[PDB]
Amino acid sequence: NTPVTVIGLGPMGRALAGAFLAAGHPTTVWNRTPGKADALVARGAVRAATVAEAVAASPLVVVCVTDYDAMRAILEPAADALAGRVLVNLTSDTPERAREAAAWAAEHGADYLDGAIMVPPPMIGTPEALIFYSGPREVFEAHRATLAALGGSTYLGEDPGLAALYDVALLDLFWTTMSGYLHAAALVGSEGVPAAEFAPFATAIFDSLSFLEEMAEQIDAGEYPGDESTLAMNAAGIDHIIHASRAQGIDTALPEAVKALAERAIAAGHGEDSFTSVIEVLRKP
Amino acid sequence: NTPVTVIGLGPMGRALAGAFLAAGHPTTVWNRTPGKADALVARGAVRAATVAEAVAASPLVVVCVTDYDAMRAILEPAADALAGRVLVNLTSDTPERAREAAAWAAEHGADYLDGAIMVPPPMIGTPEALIFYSGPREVFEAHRATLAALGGSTYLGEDPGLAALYDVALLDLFWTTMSGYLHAAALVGSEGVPAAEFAPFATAIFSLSFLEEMAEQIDAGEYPGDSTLAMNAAGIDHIIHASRAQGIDTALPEAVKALAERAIAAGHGEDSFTSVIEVLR
Numbered sequence: 001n002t003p004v005t006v007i008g009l010g011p012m013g014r015a016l017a018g019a020f021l022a023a024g025h026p027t028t029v030w031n032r033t034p035g036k037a038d039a040l041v042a043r044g045a046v047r048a049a050t051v052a053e054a055v056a057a058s059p060l061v062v063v064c065v066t067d068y069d070a071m072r073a074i075l076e077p078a079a080d081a082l083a084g085r086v087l088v089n090l091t092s093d094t095p096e097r098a099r100e101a102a103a104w105a106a107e108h109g110a111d112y113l114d115g116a117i118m119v120p121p122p123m124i125g126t127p128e129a130l131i132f133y134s135g136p137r138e139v140f141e142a143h144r145a146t147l148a149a150l151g152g153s154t155y156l157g158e159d160p161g162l163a164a165l166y167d168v169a170l171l172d173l174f175w176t177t178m179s180g181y182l183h184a185a186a187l188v189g190s191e192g193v194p195a196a197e198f199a200p201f202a203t204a205i206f207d208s209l210s211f212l213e214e215m216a217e218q219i220d221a222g223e224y225p226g227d228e229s230t231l232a233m234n235a236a237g238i239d240h241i242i243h244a245s246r247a248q249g250i251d252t253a254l255p256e257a258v259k260a261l262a263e264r265a266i267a268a269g270h271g272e273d274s275f276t277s278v279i280e281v282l283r284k285p
Numbered sequence: 286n287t288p289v290t291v292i293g294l295g296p297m298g299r300a301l302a303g304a305f306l307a308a309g310h311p312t313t314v315w316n317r318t319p320g321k322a323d324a325l326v327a328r329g330a331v332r333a334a335t336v337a338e339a340v341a342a343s344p345l346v347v348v349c350v351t352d353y354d355a356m357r358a359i360l361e362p363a364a365d366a367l368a369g370r371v372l373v374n375l376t377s378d379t380p381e382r383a384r385e386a387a388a389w390a391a392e393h394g395a396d397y398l399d400g401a402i403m404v405p406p407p408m409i410g411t412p413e414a415l416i417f418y419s420g421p422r423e424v425f426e427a428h429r430a431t432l433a434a435l436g437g438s439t440y441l442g443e444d445p446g447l448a449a450l451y452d453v454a455l456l457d458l459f460w461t462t463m464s465g466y467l468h469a470a471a472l473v474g475s476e477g478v479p480a481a482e483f484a485p486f487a488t489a490i491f492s493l494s495f496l497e498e499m500a501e502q503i504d505a506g507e508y509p510g511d512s513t514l515a516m517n518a519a520g521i522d523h524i525i526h527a528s529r530a531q532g533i534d535t536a537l538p539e540a541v542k543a544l545a546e547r548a549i550a551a552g553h554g555e556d557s558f559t560s561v562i563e564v565l566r
């Protein structure tokens with residue numbers, strides 16, 4: 001099959017190389033720290049001695065390092081060896097850095113595809129993998145078959161920063177939800193309730209994750225019907241959360257933050273509308 | 286069946302009275318603003334004239350208004366009639382306000398039950414109905430059958446404010462999650478991405494065990510990072526820098542950042558994100 005190069009042998013990089021090898025790709029690997037490829041070489045991987053030698057061994061080069069600052073530090077020595085090849089940046093960073101990488105890649109004659117892995121390494125090489133991809137459509141189709149070895153490719157568009165945008169946007173949701181759960185856990189924990197007793201209920205407050213698409217209809221329509229629950233009614237509930245958190249001894253930074261956003265919308269005349277109307281103030285720094 | 290009184294005929298109050306009427310309970314209803322009981326009265330409801338007659342008409346009095354100050358203003362005239370009866374307060378408020386109501390009820394000779402409706406009005410009367418209850422166990426056992434008309438009773442304990450604490454905490458999670466989703470929708474929208482195209486992916490990330498898994502790290506006090514708070518914080522930095530460049534407000538993600546920085550300054554950057562609970566506490 002097509003030869004592929006994985007630059008960076010961390011937890012994810014090692015999984016990526018393994019998935020390429022399992023699909024029959026002659027995989028050339030390289031890492032700054034030696035002693036992490038023993039399992040890959042036993043499966044067929046060729047350990048390269050130089051980044052430039054690794055970049056020159058395959059038509060497709062996948063780089064999976066911590067940030068782009070590292071990606072640019074590793075690949076500058078081989079910046080020209082990227083000649084005529086495609087760089088698949090599966091490093092997670094900002095949309096701006098993905099666009100600067102693309103321009104940097106074009107400067108050195110290389111094609112560029114920006115990717116974002118949305119699963120842990122164990123799920124690479126399996127149908128559970130969700131990898132976003134953005135950049136020139138032709139380049140994706142030309143290498144879609146090779147990238148299938150990693151899992152579920154999902155082309156988003158031509159803008160190199162799209163994949164990163166989806167990435168930071170989905171991590172924005174995940175960590176913000178994370179913080180709310182931990183705050184709720186602490187609040188009930190102030191009265192001795194084990195988190196194991198609150199967790200089955202915290203699963204029910206979300207029931208089917210339908211709200212995602214119900215509110216998306218409002219956002220896309222720009223119409224936030226405040227029928228039933230209004231933003232001002234919801235804001236009253238936040239006040240109860242803040243005063244309960246204060247009374248119970250828990251920090252009230254996060255709930256006050258959500259309260260500030262609600263007030264901003266109410267100050268913009270959305271008091272009557274739904275909570276989804278808070279997006280109107282979220283779009284204004 | 287047992288007679289029941291419903292004080293407050295807003296969307297929820299009318300749903301509660303209808304659920305009692307369906308279960309065969311003789312239901313007396315009453316509300317400050319007239320003209321909302323026609324459907325209930327056609328199904329058997331008895332519209333009381335005064336709140337003191339309504340309170341006096343039933344052994345079980347269910348009050349469901351906007352807040353605690355409203356219940357205290359609308360029952361203050363009939364505080365004497367409450368003696369010997371049971372006030373089941375389904376009005377959502379703070380745990381402290383729940384403990385105060387129980388005391389006020391006791392001073393007037395009434396048993397008190399604090400409740401928290403976690404479902405919308407349409408779900409009342411249905412198996413999906415989730416209503417938390419707290420207060421003395423005996424009073425709840427005396428009226429479990431009558432309260433079953435409203436749906437899934439979940440008796441939490443004896444503390445009158447316990448049901449309200451579960452209430453605020455689940456709402457803390459719900460609204461915080463809502464805020465994060467809107468911010469993520471705004472972030473993808475800065476590049477024209479329709480919220481309807483993002484919703485399917487937002488679901489895939491949520492794939493529901495993260496609640497129970499962290500509950501054990503929180504119960505054990507052991508936050509093993511392998512993902513560590515230090516790395517997670519660097520991604521939250523990317524969210525802020527990206528949002529600022531994309532023209533999106535950074536207040537909310539920065540609030541999340543301040544929380545991870547607090548736990549890091551406490552010596553948890555090598556623990557899990559779950560360890561944030563320690564600074565929350």
Ligand SMILES: NC(=O)c1ccc[n+]([C@@H]2O[C@H](COP(=O)([O-])OP(=O)(O)OC[C@H]3O[C@@H](n4cnc5c(N)ncnc54)[C@H](OP(=O)(O)O)[C@@H]3O)[C@@H](O)[C@H]2O)c1
Nearest residue numbers: 008009010011012013032033065066070091092117119120
């Ligand atoms: N759960 C996951 O693991 C997961 C899931 C989705 C996405 N990702 C993304 O995938 C990428 C890889 O993550 P990871 O799990 O492998 O851990 P990581 O610590 O983010 O990256 C480890 C890799 O980066 C290399 N590296 C970092 N800084 C370097 C530098 N200055 N010079 C040279 N190499 C450098 C490491 O080299 P050494 O090995 O020599 O130290 C190693 O190969 C990250 O961008 C991460 O956000 C990870």
Ligand SMILES: NC(=O)c1ccc[n+]([C@@H]2O[C@H](COP(=O)([O-])OP(=O)(O)OC[C@H]3O[C@@H](n4cnc5c(N)ncnc54)[C@H](OP(=O)(O)O)[C@@H]3O)[C@@H](O)[C@H]2O)c1
Nearest residue numbers: 293294295296297298317318350351355376377402404405
């Ligand atoms: N319906 C829901 O979606 C839902 C779901 C779960 C929990 N809850 C909670 O359960 C309760 C039901 O709320 P709701 O949806 O019915 O609407 P609401 O606006 O929260 O409650 C309004 C009710 O309280 C009365 N009221 C409010 N302020 C009053 C005052 N100052 N003096 C006298 N009466 C006053 C209203 O009388 P008027 O009708 O005359 O204005 C009406 O009966 C609330 O505590 C809510 O937080 C509601």
